[PDB]
Design a protein around this ligand. Structure first.
Ligand SMILES: Nc1ncnc2c1ncn2[C@@H]1O[C@H](COP(=O)(O)OP(=O)(O)NP(=O)(O)O)[C@@H](O)[C@H]1O
Ligand SMILES: Nc1ncnc2c1ncn2[C@@H]1O[C@H](COP(=O)(O)OP(=O)(O)NP(=O)(O)O)[C@@H](O)[C@H]1O
Lengths: 650, 642
């Protein structure tokens, strides 16, 4: 009972040897010449990332002197501007990336630049941590970024000016570097100028527009003014001046509400390069394993190239950022296919990057991004007002939501509540599934729907004629994807969907059962009158009203289901000529009120071997197939029957 | 470069340095995406050691010294949490264990290779794999401590063990336990428990090391069940053998083994590509269409073709090397000259992807073209006919060559499919047009009122049965000079004799008739009415040149991947058609005698709306309203009884 004071443990490499002893511990070395060549020749895919790294280095340099500027009063001195400035020089085959950051002392120019996998930024980070404090803008981690500037240049000339030290010149050729004091005075007030002596194969980076698009591609949010010595050709002659590249302001960095509705729409217009305001937007911050904080958008109109090469075409609408630096627009694991219209940004600070800085190192961190992005998206679409949802949204991205029901399984219930279809409750207006079950009768327990090519052919369908007459609500499907969306949905609010073109619809009746038994002779004749496999059953329908009714099985293709499959291109030659083709099992149904009842029976009561009575019994079934929206086997069969029955009549 | 100064001066020069521990961490946690590549690297290293000791043997007679067997053996201890990769290669001296394993980016293989290139031997300059000295370090992706025991000739057996930080070397107190070679023992992490089950390892070596040119054995089970070494790589690299010295039966055996198929390939091709890139390749076409060939369609890379560099598996992702419509082509691609990324999972030069692609497609299409005509129609076209059609639409660079491979059902034979070169060889002396009809089936297409006069006159009509066919022909501007012509659209020009200009007189005879239909029958239904010059034995609907056919409309109306706007606001769905009227038709001649008798006549109007609606059905067009047609035909059936 009384606890003793003894404490347990919780934890603790063989080879068949007698005993293991210690001897001669070494430290790993490195052949620098071959390691350098690995980085330059066999590491990166795109050689354009050199500017991305040089700018990031310049950004870190700027952020460093800014932190020091806080705990100092003479840090900036003469020049208080913290800007990165890039200038081309085609006349001398040179590219310049100049910044006004902290710069580098002579010891640093040797140590930091001359040592692979050495990061002064990483070390600076460490001192700041030991010392709110916002290092969270420091991008550098590896020590190889600067060496990526040897991809497009034979020689790199680095001129740096650190406080309390002389301006020096650092020149290299990837094999060795020379460090010399600048003969000129402190031409640079403070900071660094990285000059690249480009190669003949890199003549592209001498041209202006190449650089402009390059800095805009990777570095447009790096929290420091980036200018490029550009031409304007106005006032009309060419005038050169520093043109700002990162115009856009990181709205995401600010917390909710600092900025309002206004500056949001402006952000969407500028970032996504759109002219019209977004239909909606969401600003949120996920935290935990992933912690990023992002802004997502839904466009006002459906993009022009939407649904073109669906699945294959990766959308560049969402751009991934890590520490204000662009990583990738590939969200095929962080965003599903049916949400390929959603635009926006995703920035983060502690997302582990690959050395390529184009992909996240941990593949496991992708789906945890998706679960938050998708959820925030579906909440955003749900947050859209009911009026605006039907009148504007659904026309644009209704198909997407339907596809979501088919694809996404973990959001099928949530997406189903966003579904909108036409109905019999209104000649034109669309309804939700929640609005259907709210208008459902007692003990209905079935959501009746009709699928067809158009609204007119669906509402004027022989099926559910008694259902509409009884007051049952019928959902009309007018688009090819509709039927699949419903078929992929098991139950909604405890109600099961029921196709009115297929069997399963059930509506005294026991007295009427005796009446059906009376209507037994004609059905038998139909199976004989009817060719071999022409029909399966010829019972009389109790769901008909005023129409002379091909009903599919519970596990059979509908007339509308059938037309879509048949018109689908991507299918093999062997597969096309298959699946039973046209016939399946065509069940006939009928109601008594006209020639269906006694007029056809009088002939059947007279003689079953008459030619006139077999022709009239054939055309009735013939036009019933088109009445039920099925494919006509022969256009000339039912066609010439009209050309002959109208010649003597008219 | 000059910079405002005319005094470029020379001061101190330095050599670059490295912070090893941080560069180590980069390789461990920030380089590779797949942690399973560790076994790929150890096998390659083991292979290199085996190739070195063999190259020495060719000049040194005392190298083997009673250890002639050159193999690789893998054994994993589940109980002891260990993984052993043992070879009988050249091994490493004590100095080499420190130099080669302790110096990052240092490759002893690269040094061994350069010595041979310097003088005359190019015998095995393509057998050695290791270039950058970082592969061995991928062992710490799945292991905390790596123990390496090596025995080199003319030196004692030493033991090398380490974590990422420091490494130690010690002479093995067990002595010469390995006759010659190396054993890399990996103390696997908790997470890397999967590499302890032999079957996981079994598939892993087979995945990458299938043609490593050295016997690889794994300690596995085989049924009383007993344990022994099982050979992994048995599939010989036949592509290295020249086209003349390779057995035709070997190709069939190679395919059924490499691609895991029970049936022989429909065809094969063996070629050596030189120039910008240099590689050997054996492409294959399966005997039957793979299930799910088009299920993903687009967005799906096919693991049918595999890329090998120096007999080591690189990748199966080809999408930049092979187009979508050739996703059925299987085979191998091997090179010894293609520069690789440090990850060894992709090519380094992206520009070379286009170079390989154009070579592979070229040899693929020629391979298809080489197939005998007799076996082509009966086997290939049935399985991959759809692919060729898609290729016509997609590949513009080879649209002509792919067109020569197209096959379609013609009116020249009840069931046989024909070539387009056969069609143009069966055209008249002044046809210069390829007439075709598109429909849901052949029965619908051959019994269509558009081909009535054409077949009677002596012209040939191609029948398109599959919905992708019209897309395929649309992508074709002209074939052998001739131009495709839709028989359901305007353009067909028939008869230039005196009987043709006599039809101009019939135009005036039908002029009051023509205008009546535009205003009696629904004016917003029928576009226009014109005299039908191409109509024989039928009552009655053509479309414009750049307009939808009845078939074309049937497909678009089923295309599910469209927005709710594009389907509701599509003009072609609401577009009207030109109604053509045949003069010889008895039902048409009695129609002009009824309007005059009773213009604004009710019965006269009725037949016109009925005929037009039957014309919509006779063509591929869907009836706008079927209830109005279904009720009026119920009144027509009242002729028997009311
Ligand atoms: N423009 C610059 N101004 C000032 N200091 C710089 C500049 N560029 C580089 N440095 C310093 O030199 C060090 C080496 O940089 P680098 O080798 O590019 O690795 P990095 O800074 O971590 N970038 P990366 O390898 O992509 O993570 C940096 O950590 C800085 O301390
Ligand atoms: N099992 C072994 N037997 C003999 N020598 C070995 C063995 N493993 C490694 N070595 C030597 O150690 C050197 C360093 O290994 P490694 O880091 O893999 O360089 P590598 O051969 O270029 N591998 P890779 O990265 O794929 O190019 C190799 O170049 C070999 O000379």
């Amino acid at each position: 009972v009384q606890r003793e004071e003894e404490a347990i443990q919780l934890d603790g490499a063989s080879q068949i040897r007698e005993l293991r002893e210690k001897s001669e511990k070494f430290a790993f070395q490195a052949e620098v010449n071959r390691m350098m060549k690995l980085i330059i020749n066999s590491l990166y895919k795109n050689k354009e990332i050199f500017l991305r790294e040089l700018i990031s280095n310049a950004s870190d340099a700027l952020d460093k002197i800014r932190l020091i500027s806080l705990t100092d009063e003479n840090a900036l001195a003469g020049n208080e501007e913290l800007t990165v400035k890039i200038k081309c020089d085609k006349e001398k085959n040179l590219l310049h990336v100049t910044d006004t950051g902290v710069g580098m002392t002579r010891e640093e120019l040797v140590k930091n630049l001359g040592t692979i996998a050495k990061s002064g930024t990483s070390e600076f980070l460490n001192k700041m941590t030991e010392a709110g404090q916002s290092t969270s803008e420091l991008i550098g981690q590896f020590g190889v970024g600067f060496y990526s500037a040897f991809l497009v240049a034979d020689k790199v000339i680095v001129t740096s000016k650190h406080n309390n030290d002389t301006q020096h010149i650092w020149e290299s050729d990837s094999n060795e570097f020379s460090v010399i004091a600048d003969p000129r005075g402190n031409t640079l007030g403070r900071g660094t100028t990285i000059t690249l002596v480009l190669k003949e194969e890199a003549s592209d980076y001498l041209e202006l527009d190449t650089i402009k698009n390059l800095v805009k591609k990777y570095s447009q949010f790096i929290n420091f003014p980036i200018y490029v010595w550009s031409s304007k050709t106005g006032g009309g002659k060419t005038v050169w001046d520093w043109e700002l590249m990162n115009d856009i302001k990181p709205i995401w960095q600010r917390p909710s509400k600092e900025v309002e509705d206004d500056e949001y729409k402006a952000f969407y217009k500028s970032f996504s390069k759109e002219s019209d305001d977004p239909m909606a937007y969401i600003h949120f911050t996920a935290e935990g394993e992933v912690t990023f904080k992002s802004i997502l958008f839904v466009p006002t109109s459906a993009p022009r190239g939407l649904f073109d090469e669906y699945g294959s075409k990766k959308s560049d609408y969402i751009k991934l950022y890590v520490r204000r630096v662009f990583i990738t627009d590939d969200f095929h694991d962080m965003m599903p296919k049916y949400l390929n219209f959603v635009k926006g940004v995703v920035d983060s600070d502690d997302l582990p990057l690959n050395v390529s800085r184009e992909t996240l190192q941990q593949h496991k961190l992708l789906k945890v991004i998706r679960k938050k992005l998708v959820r925030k998206t579906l909440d955003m679409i749900k947050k859209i007002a009911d009026e605006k949802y039907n009148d504007t949204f659904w026309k644009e991205f209704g198909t997407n939501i339907k596809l979501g029901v088919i694809e996404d399984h973990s959001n099928r219930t949530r997406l189903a509540k966003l579904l909108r279809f036409q109905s019999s409750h209104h000649p034109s207006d669309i309804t939700s599934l929640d609005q259907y079950v709210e208008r459902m009768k007692e003990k209905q327990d079935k959501i009746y729907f009709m699928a067809g090519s158009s609204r007119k052919e669906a509402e004027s369908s022989p099926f559910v004629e008694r259902l509409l007459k009884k007051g049952y609500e019928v959902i009309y499907l007018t688009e090819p994807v509709d039927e699949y969306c419903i078929q992929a949905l098991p139950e909604f609010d405890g109600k099961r969907f029921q196709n009115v073109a297929k069997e399963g619809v059930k509506f005294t009746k026991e007295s009427r059962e005796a009446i059906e038994k009376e209507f037994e002779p004609l059905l038998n004749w139909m199976k004989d009158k009817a060719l071999k496999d022409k029909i399966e059953k010829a019972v009389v329908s109790q769901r008909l009203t005023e129409s002379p009714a091909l009903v599919a099985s519970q596990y059979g293709w509908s007339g509308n289901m059938e037309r879509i499959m048949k018109a689908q291109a991507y299918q093999t030659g062997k597969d096309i000529s298959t699946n039973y083709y046209a016939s399946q099992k065509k069940t006939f149904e009928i109601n008594p009120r006209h020639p269906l009842i006694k007029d056809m029976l009088r002939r059947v009561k007279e003689d079953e071997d008459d030619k006139t009575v077999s022709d009239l019994a054939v055309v009735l079934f013939e036009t019933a197939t088109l009445r039920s929206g099925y494919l006509l086997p022969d256009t000339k069969a039912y066609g010439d029957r009209i050309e002959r029955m109208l010649r003597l009549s008219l």
